[PDB]
């Protein structure tokens, strides 16, 4: 099952991300169901927005929104929902939503998958346009869903991302 | 596994549908294999037709064609094969095929996924064009497959759909 | 050429819309060039948004942004850029942008193309979700493009849409 | 303009086909407008069917339905609406519809474009499945459009196709 | 799980192939992970090439590259990654790569799925273009990945393919 | 017509490129016909390769292969065949093919369309992977077409690209 995938080969620098939503896809918000491992439709998004990157989570982690910690993974081509990608964290967008605090990690494909992202070492190496698109997306994607809301609080660096990974891996572990 | 998804949160009004074939897709007829939970290609359809809605089944049900009961789910965008959608039954197309009687339920995305279909309470609220397309599809999609055939017998309302769900949930339960 | 297509068979109730951008497409903002009739890339949109409907213009009209008046056309399936669709106006989103006032008409496929939209007679017959998505789109799609901006000013009815069509058809005519 | 493309390099064996509808596409029935050369939406098809091959016409020809003669062109990948393909006729499906008699030619990509279809010399060399799909399509695609109808009358060989081409090229020529 | 799918209904003539990569897809090289059954991104291919056919493996087999034996499956439409197709072997491209010897079987959809490939009995019945495309693909797809390499050694017939299947099914069985 | 588009707003630094083939598309080699302006299928490519970037030409130029000079344009999303993009030359891949010498320019979207490529000033600023993919593509895409061949001769800088543009604009001008 997708429930039995590790958090990573060597957390926090070498992680696996389970993809739920491909980059640039139709506005279907899929989420993996914890007990079955199946991809469920969480909702049909109301705004005419798309995720700027592939979107998923790190297995065996727990955030403060009651879900595994969330990751954006830029790739040259969109990934399949339910697939798993080896990546390296490079930054994090801090934010809270209606279900609790809910950081959005950015992790790039691992060097072994591709050399394309090897030059992205830290958050300042991400394209400004991409970071700005990601922030705008999270600021606005819930604008038409009553009872769903966001506070975006800014970008933090790879060490912050890594600290989040470690802390979420510790959370699910005695939870 | 997709074999461990419930029939629904509160059958028959609140169901889960496992999707096998997206709306408006290529003519590959996928079916979930009961023992592995995998998506198998059942066949390459011979007619140049597509399913008017996403197509799948309710887990832990049994129809008279030896398969779980079949459901059509209209959505704004096609769903992924193998994904699961929470829905609400609104009508049923009665029909029989070569493998035995084989009703085609229509269920719309649950209000929690989207408000888009909340106005569809019963079968008369479905668009006439959509119902007519669905009936035509089932009347003709097997026209070029020898030994596969259909008798479409007309549309019935949400209570009939719900009765079918309950009865199929009872069938698999002592089968 | 696409420059020689009429404004419509019987303006303002029966119009032709030249499509520039399909619904639910990649964020490439195409515009027809007036002198060549070719589809040019105006820009690569910076926000992660898509047009909720097909988007184009009525030929031989002139708005206050120096362009033909702009139209959104809902369809069951996205249209090809450069194609032309016969439609019927049903409402208008009033708004201004950096290039001047710039109304966004909504027109549905003509009955002769499809009966699907015949029940949409006026702006109140459009789905609330669709109208809300359209307004949100225009409110936010320029949020990351410096020097591009929007003031959305609300929805008006089919007669207002029709008055706009007539007035823009008169503008280009002694311009 | 697409109005100025020849009927072919050497009719009837070497023709050009202007494509209006790609194979396996969404059910949007495009038609080139004779006076503008633009692709217009003729209608949104009501049945859940797709064209088994790319579909278009031979320029500077005239059929008995008031339109240029119609051609199906099988290709390995769907063609773009408005593109032009060099082909070789191999057979014809005879049929009439509401607008008058309306043969459906089949022509394969010319050897110069690809060697893939060089083995298809005549109608008996077309796959049986493809011919059967084409006939079924034309038998049924108008089943839900009132006032549109078809009589399919069977397959004829490459010489018959070629005779049709010549005769339609003569028709438009003193018409 | 995809790990519990059989090698086939009646090996070697009747096999199941688990698909990892669809025909004509984006250059994402997916591989099923043996212990989780999940689809992992193995790498982002560096060359601008696509697989000429759907690509996957026979479960419960073991090749000399440490992986299940690899199969190409031509279909009329691309298959979903993670789906399973019943097929019949018709030939094999012999080759070695950096991970060891690594034959590429070709197997066509079983007659029960479609009659389309029933005329392909042996390797000489495959289109020359398709075989040539497959060989060229394997000759060149690793050209830009350092440390990945190929020696293509030519085509062999259905009996050779079948012998490979049997031998790989025996290998994993006491391994 | 696409024949009446300028070479550029201010050649050679500010050019327009007419797109014939989108990036990452199916292997249909379209070419604009000079006398009609229509997109014709030149051929169905035999290798399983795709263009790494959008591909087209500069109007009103003439190369030594008897065609307008050829340009690759990287974009975030593939462009429509027949569309026109404003760009800035940054480098050139020198090469000859069977029809004569045939340089492949690389030009990035103009700053006015997007700021994404503003950091690419010269050929050394292009990603190494992209340049390597482009060279490999041209080295191999004709490998299965008899009588079509290539000699790739290496990368040259933006000034070389610009000199090519100027010289081709002069060639068509007294030709
Ligand atoms: Cl773990
Ligand atoms: Cl930002
Ligand atoms: Cl249950
Ligand atoms: Cl009906
Ligand atoms: Cl007019
Ligand atoms: Cl609104
Ligand atoms: Cl002619
Ligand atoms: Cl037939
Ligand atoms: Cl087995
Ligand atoms: Cl070969
Ligand atoms: Cl010029
Ligand atoms: Cl290079
Ligand atoms: F989450
Ligand atoms: F079933
Ligand atoms: F405009
Ligand atoms: F016609
Ligand atoms: F392998
Ligand atoms: F060229
Ligand atoms: Mg959630
Ligand atoms: Mg999450
Ligand atoms: Mg959240
Ligand atoms: Mg979350
Ligand atoms: Mg079945
Ligand atoms: Mg079923
Ligand atoms: Mg059935
Ligand atoms: Mg059934
Ligand atoms: Mg503009
Ligand atoms: Mg406009
Ligand atoms: Mg504007
Ligand atoms: Mg405007
Ligand atoms: Mg017609
Ligand atoms: Mg016609
Ligand atoms: Mg007709
Ligand atoms: Mg006709
Ligand atoms: Mg491998
Ligand atoms: Mg393998
Ligand atoms: Mg290998
Ligand atoms: Mg292998
Ligand atoms: Mg050429
Ligand atoms: Mg060229
Ligand atoms: Mg060339
Ligand atoms: Mg050239
Ligand atoms: Na998309
Ligand atoms: Na909200
Ligand atoms: Na489709
Ligand atoms: Na049948
Ligand atoms: Na899209
Ligand atoms: Na702005
Ligand atoms: Na399609
Ligand atoms: Na009819
Ligand atoms: Na593809
Ligand atoms: Na290599
Ligand atoms: Na593609
Ligand atoms: Na060659």
From Swiss-Prot, chains A, B, C, D, E, F:
Mg(2+) 2 binds at residue 70. It is found in: Cytoplasm. The keyword Cytoplasm applies. Keywords: Cytoplasm, Hydrolase, Magnesium, Metal-binding. GO terms for cellular component: cytosol; membrane. Mg(2+) 1 binds at residues 65, 70, 102. Pfam families: Pyrophosphatase. Disulfide bonds: none annotated. It catalyses: diphosphate + H2O = 2 phosphate + H(+). One of its GO terms (biological process) is phosphate-containing compound metabolic process. One of its GO terms (molecular function) is magnesium ion binding. It is an enzyme of class 3 (hydrolase). Substrate binds at residues 29, 43, 55, 141. Its EC number is 3.6.1.1. Its cofactor is Mg(2+). InterPro entries: Pyrophosphatase (IPR008162), Pyrophosphatase_sf (IPR036649). SUPFAM superfamilies: Inorganic pyrophosphatase. HAMAP family: Inorganic_PPase. Catalyzes the hydrolysis of inorganic pyrophosphate (PPi) forming two phosphate ions. Belongs to the PPase family. Homohexamer. NCBIfam families: PRK01250.1 (NF002317). This is Inorganic pyrophosphatase. The gene is ppa.
